[PDB]
Amino acid sequence: HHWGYGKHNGPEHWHKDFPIAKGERQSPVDIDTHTAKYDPSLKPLSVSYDQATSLRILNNGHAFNVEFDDSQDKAVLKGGPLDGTYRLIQFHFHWGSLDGQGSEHTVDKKKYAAELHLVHWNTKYGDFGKAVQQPDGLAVLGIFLKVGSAKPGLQKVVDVLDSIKTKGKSADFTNFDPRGLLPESLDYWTYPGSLTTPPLLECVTWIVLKEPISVSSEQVLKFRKLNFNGEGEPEELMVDNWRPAQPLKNRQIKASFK
Numbered sequence: 001h002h003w004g005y006g007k008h009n010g011p012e013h014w015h016k017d018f019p020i021a022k023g024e025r026q027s028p029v030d031i032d033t034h035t036a037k038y039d040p041s042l043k044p045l046s047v048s049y050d051q052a053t054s055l056r057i058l059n060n061g062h063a064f065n066v067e068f069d070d071s072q073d074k075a076v077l078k079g080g081p082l083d084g085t086y087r088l089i090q091f092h093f094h095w096g097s098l099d100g101q102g103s104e105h106t107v108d109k110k111k112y113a114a115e116l117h118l119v120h121w122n123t124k125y126g127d128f129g130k131a132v133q134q135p136d137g138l139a140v141l142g143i144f145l146k147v148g149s150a151k152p153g154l155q156k157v158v159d160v161l162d163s164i165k166t167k168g169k170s171a172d173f174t175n176f177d178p179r180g181l182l183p184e185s186l187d188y189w190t191y192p193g194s195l196t197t198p199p200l201l202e203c204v205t206w207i208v209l210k211e212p213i214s215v216s217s218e219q220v221l222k223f224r225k226l227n228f229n230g231e232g233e234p235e236e237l238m239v240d241n242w243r244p245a246q247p248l249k250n251r252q253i254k255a256s257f258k
């Protein structure tokens, strides 16, 4: 009876295994655009993904991760609200059973069809597993997906998904360029938060881009053909793998713009 996204093991249940679920800086949150504070001292985000080395794509039973070689400073996030340098380790998405839901963060209560998370760890902690035990260990760049025109830089990911349909399947996945997943603007909101999945550790500086990317209905349909179950088990489509918005509590969301 491990955690997941069903009636009996989904978000409302996670606090029994992971009591920090009811903690003081949980994510995601609703971003109330009117009450976010513009902070003119926030720096432009620096996304340096030119030397990124993707290695592999994995169905982990909750999402799929595209993993990167994070053993050198090849794909790094810095600037923005951050002090220091954070290395990209993986990205993944959360998405819905329908186009009207799927994102974890919301914007004035609006749900997007999906949300991309590019996960980075602070180099001062040497690796991801040590970083997650620190309050400034991770920086996650969140990007909303709306359904409309296709995102051409996504199609390499969608095309490989049939090879990793079930939990535990992986495939080599080299030379994927995550710059093809970015919107034109790097304007962002930022706040301190947590992992959105167990163990829900309070180690994340969230950086959520204002501008969504558009993906086609065919692209998101392929995400919904994935399976949360392993091969040889009854089919449970991997859909609605999102945690709802959690209480803001004693936090202020900052804007880099307007």
Ligand SMILES: COC(=O)c1ccc(Cl)c(S(N)(=O)=O)c1
Pocket (backbone or CB within 6 Å): 060, 062, 063, 117, 119, 138, 140, 194, 195, 196, 197, 198, 199, 204
């Ligand atoms: C199964 O998802 C994860 O274990 C996981 C690990 C790291 C992070 Cl930062 C995230 S998320 N959704 O980006 O907060 C998710």
Ligand code: NA
Pocket (backbone or CB within 6 Å): 158, 159, 160, 161, 162, 163
């Ligand atoms: Na395919």
Ligand SMILES: [Zn+2]
Pocket (backbone or CB within 6 Å): 092, 093, 094, 117, 196
């Ligand atoms: Zn995520």
